[PDB]
Write an enzyme that holds these catalytic residues in place. Structure first.
Site: not given
Ligand SMILES: O=C([O-])C(=O)[O-]
Ligand SMILES: [Mg+2]
Ligand SMILES: O=C([O-])C(=O)[O-]
Ligand SMILES: [Mg+2]
Lengths: 572, 572
Positions: A188, A295, A331, A430, A453-454, A464, A501
């Site tokens: 992040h 976010r 979100r 995710e 990402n997650d 990560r 995203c």
């Molecule tokens: O939250 C996000 O964007 C992710 O986990 O990829």
């Molecule tokens: Mg995430």
């Protein structure tokens, strides 16, 4: 010196190591003749701590308001407390302690007494005092003082690591970029940095011991090198590189108003990931069609206390209005990953990223979930807003959250407070669970957005933020790319759509695949908008679809990359 | 008091508290009378340290031999070194520090001196010095030192948490069970306790604050309650509860020899997971048809040094032989989530469970992978062994490791060393990656064993260790079950088989589903073998398929629990 490219750009600047020098207390008792020098050492270091504070108090009389001032004025009081020059001076005089040993013990006593009462307000002073304690001590001790909000000159940050929180409050007029020992592409921290348009390299191993304060550095985050004290000749080359970067921006800015359609007529939405109202310029500038992910955490971080319904509502209102006619996917709050919200004192976990994160916190503390959802609905009065939930793993969770949404909606109706009755409710995908259960979830929500990402972290079981295994972090593996396919399909099977995203949506390497896999919306760092817009406009969807089907049948990453590679050689 | 039951049983005994006690150094200069005191305080603190190691050293020339005793002989030597006695004394006397602050300093001094020399061997001596600094400092500050291996009397252990290694070193004759604040059902510590037949309750709020050292507890890990200083008529009820428990064994016992065949003729294997030859006994006792998972880590935590090729070979040979005709599935080593081995001194990670774990180590340090695979192969000359790999995430990983096997195979061939040329190779499917590419992996291996502890963990992103979110740890999710099915099917499509060594195999509630879904092999704590055998022997396989299928379509755990229950009602 070489790490992982995190956020692009070249930066020219003096090094500033955020690594704070340790407070080493001199413990040799002093002599009667010293007693005067030491008193004056403390009085001198104090006046110096009190200085820095006056110049943090006048700063916060501006860039923070007229209440943030009082907070820092109260600090100045704590520093200039006459109980302190009292006790401290008596320790030096009567027990021949160093001014720094004295400060250390009077502070600790002061703080410890304050906690020893059963009070939340006095429990805050003790922290204040200890923090004033440090400032004083370090000022007495001769140590340098690093002010992230109040940086004086253009520098490049070098640290072991950086928290999204830390990255939040970074003075942009002054920090030109940063480099860290640890971290990974998809922390992040790196993510945020991208929308701060701040160049950053992160997997350096040991920058903190190859770089010293005031080394002139070129953080080349195009080609992934740092140069420490470079020749004029190297600087010039690096200035040509800097300029070449600008030329591209210029050529790519020609796509700004163009839609993201494939050669064969297939349109997808290209949006920006945001964290704050200010990230919206980035978005306008790079030809965003809207915001695929807001976010909200970064709000909760942007401050020192937990934002109320009121303050959130102000903040989501501003983002909505700042997006004019364009939609925003807000979100709900994802804290608990590598995203500390320190001012909360959640307890340490052995595996934060497998811990009490995002949706799990709000469900444990309805107070938090209620304010937010309330704040967003109230704000959907002034913009096209969607609601999305992070860290979904079960249908059960989605159902519970819907209950809450319907409860808050009534409360709003009951209080004559407007919200968009038609508001769309979506879920992040995710989690390898959410991907597995996607058919089901697609039935319960309006849309998906894949957080690669997650999903990658969790599918591949690789953290990560962990440089050491980062070579295992592969969002473009047959594993993750087939889960991605599943999700997208599950969605379309229910007439719903899927955004993304996760950082993959912004990766040139993935666009054709993503495109051919039926991705509906690409949300990314604003900086990545034009380049991705480009590949989309130079792509034939139907061919991308055939490609994506053979690539995802491949058993290894390279076999898969290869297919993509040949295709790009044949098309170009 | 309740938490999460981890290992079944009922124990009666006095509480032994495990002191979290973290060393606080007294940096404040001491007074001049305090000198003879602190000097002696150090020497005796050290005498104690020396003493407690003296038993440990002699317990080593017994349980292992002269080479592993000499380790501590050196530890002792490093402790009694007069080069540190002299230095420590000097700072107490001349510089007027406490015994601890001096000792802190002299240790840190010797240790960093050793690291400063560029010698793998002395960096190791460094660690030992630091290791023994700890013990010295805990003895100096009179903090208690519980040597888990040398517990005097029958006690019940009470602790914040308990690491697999710790659990490994429990005198099985004297510790009758344990209770921790933190933990999970599925934490490796929990799991090891099952094969030790040690009753355990984890994840209490706060047993630490609720139990006094030397309290009389009845730890009831059957009904999930701990009584603190029970009333004698409670000491009675419990004693009768314990009778029932013992009769249950006696009845289940009768299946010891019976196969695991459903009423309608469907057979599965049912085996023990083990840690140590010593577990073979429980396995034979409980009617195991072979060993489904030989967690080799546990053998590594059964020692205070990394076991060489030869030590491993011997250990494997013994197991292979203590298993007679039976097949052992030897998993290569899985260190690095909640199972560290302290002697490795690996660095800390932000998320061990998403970190540098198992195969990721053996591939970054071939000597480890090589010694081990070498040892396994060679041991296969002595009994039916299989090789299985943990934490597999990609087809890439498997091919690189098979290639490795093939190299190690030739070397053995060249050194005139037999190994079973038939030796079968498989992989843990315990990552959602693996589960996703199960089809691809199934071509590349002879078999699969699904690790649901991990698979659950990553699919749901819930830390097996984290009690705060334990309620989300559901291997009986539509998400994990689907991934299980998908793996089994992969197996069968290639004409291979899938077993299961995750705790689900041993879970009474999954048995019909696991069965219906076609799982070939179950492997569990030996103690679970009869319950599951019983369920298997009393099911109709066809009915279970129907059950499984239904369950796999449910979007909700509850809904899937309902199916299972109506089954149990209607079907036996
Ligand atoms: O939250 C996000 O964007 C992710 O986990 O990829
Ligand atoms: Mg995430
Ligand atoms: O290793 C295992 O067996 C697991 O993760 O379930
Ligand atoms: Mg496992």
């Amino acid at each position: 010196i070489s790490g992982i490219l995190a956020s692009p750009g070249i930066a020219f600047g003096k090094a500033l190591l955020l690594k704070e020098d340790e407070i080493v207390i001199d413990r040799k008792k002093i002599s009667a003749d010293q007693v005067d020098q030491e008193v004056e050492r403390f009085l001198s270091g104090r006046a110096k701590a009190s200085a820095q504070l006056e110049t943090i108090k006048t700063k916060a009389g501006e860039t923070f308001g007229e209440e943030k001032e009082a907070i820092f004025e109260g600090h100045i009081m704590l520093l200039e407390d006459e109980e302190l020059e009292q006790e401290i001076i008596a320790l030096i005089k009567d027990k021949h302690m160093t001014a720094d040993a004295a400060a250390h013990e009077v502070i600790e006593g002061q703080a410890s007494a304050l906690e020893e009462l059963d009070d939340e307000y006095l429990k805050e002073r003790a922290a204040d005092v200890r923090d004033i304690g440090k400032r004083l001590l370090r000022n007495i001790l001769g140590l340098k003082i690093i002010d992230l909000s109040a940086i004086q000159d253009e520098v490049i940050l070098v640290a072991a690591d950086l928290t999204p929180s830390e990255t939040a409050q970074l003075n942009l007029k002054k920090v030109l970029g940063f480099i860290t020992d640890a971290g990974g592409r998809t922390s992040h921290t790196s993510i945020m940095a991208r929308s701060l348009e701040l160049p950053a390299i992160v997997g350096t191993g040991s920058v903190t011991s190859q770089v010293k304060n005031d080394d002139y550095l070129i953080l080349d985050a195009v080609n992934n090198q740092v140069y420490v004290n470079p020749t004029n000749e190297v600087i010039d080359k690096m200035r040509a590189v800097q300029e070449q970067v600008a030329s591209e921006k210029a050529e790519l800015a020609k796509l700004k108003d163009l839609p993201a359609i494939t050669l064969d007529g297939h349109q997808v939405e290209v949006c920006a990931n945001i964290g704050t109202v200010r990230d919206v310029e980035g978005a306008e500038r790079n030809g965003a069609e809207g915001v695929g992910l807001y976010r909200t955490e970064f709000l909760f971080m942007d401050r020192d206390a937990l934002p109320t319904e009121e303050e959130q509502f102000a903040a989501y209102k501003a983002v909505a209005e700042a997006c004019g006619s364009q939609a925003v996917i807000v979100r709900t709050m994802d804290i608990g990953g590598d995203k500390e919200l320190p001012y909360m004192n959640f307890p340490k976990e052995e595996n934060p990223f497998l811990g009490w994160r995002a949706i799990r916190i709000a469900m444990d503390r309805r107070e938090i979930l209620r304010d937010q959802l309330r704040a967003i609905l109230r704000a959907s009065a002034f913009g096209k807003l969607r609601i999305m939930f992070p860290m979904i793993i079960s249908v059960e969770e989605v159902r519970a959250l819907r209950k809450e949404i319907e409860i808050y909606k009534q409360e709003l109706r009951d209080e004559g407070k407007a919200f968009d009755e038609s508001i769309e409710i979506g879920v992040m995908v995710e989690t390898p669970a959410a991907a597995t259960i996607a058919r089901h979830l697609a039935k319960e929500v309006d849309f998906f957005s894949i957080g690669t990402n997650d999903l990658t972290q969790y599918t591949l079981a690789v953290d990560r933020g962990n440089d050491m295994i980062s070579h295992l972090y592969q969002p473009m593996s047959p594993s993750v790319l087939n889960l991605i396919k599943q999700v997208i399909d599950a969605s379309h099977a229910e007439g719903k759509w899927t955004g993304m995203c996760g950082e993959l949506a912004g990766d040139e390497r993935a666009t054709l695949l993503l495109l051919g896999m039926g991705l509906d919306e690409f949300s990314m760092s604003a900086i990545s908008i034009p380049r991705i817009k480009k590949i989309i406009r130079n792509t034939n969807f139907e061919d991308a679809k055939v490609l994506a089907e053979q690539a995802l049948a491949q058993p290894t990453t390279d076999e898969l990359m290869t297919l993509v590679n040949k295709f790009i050689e044949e098309k170009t």
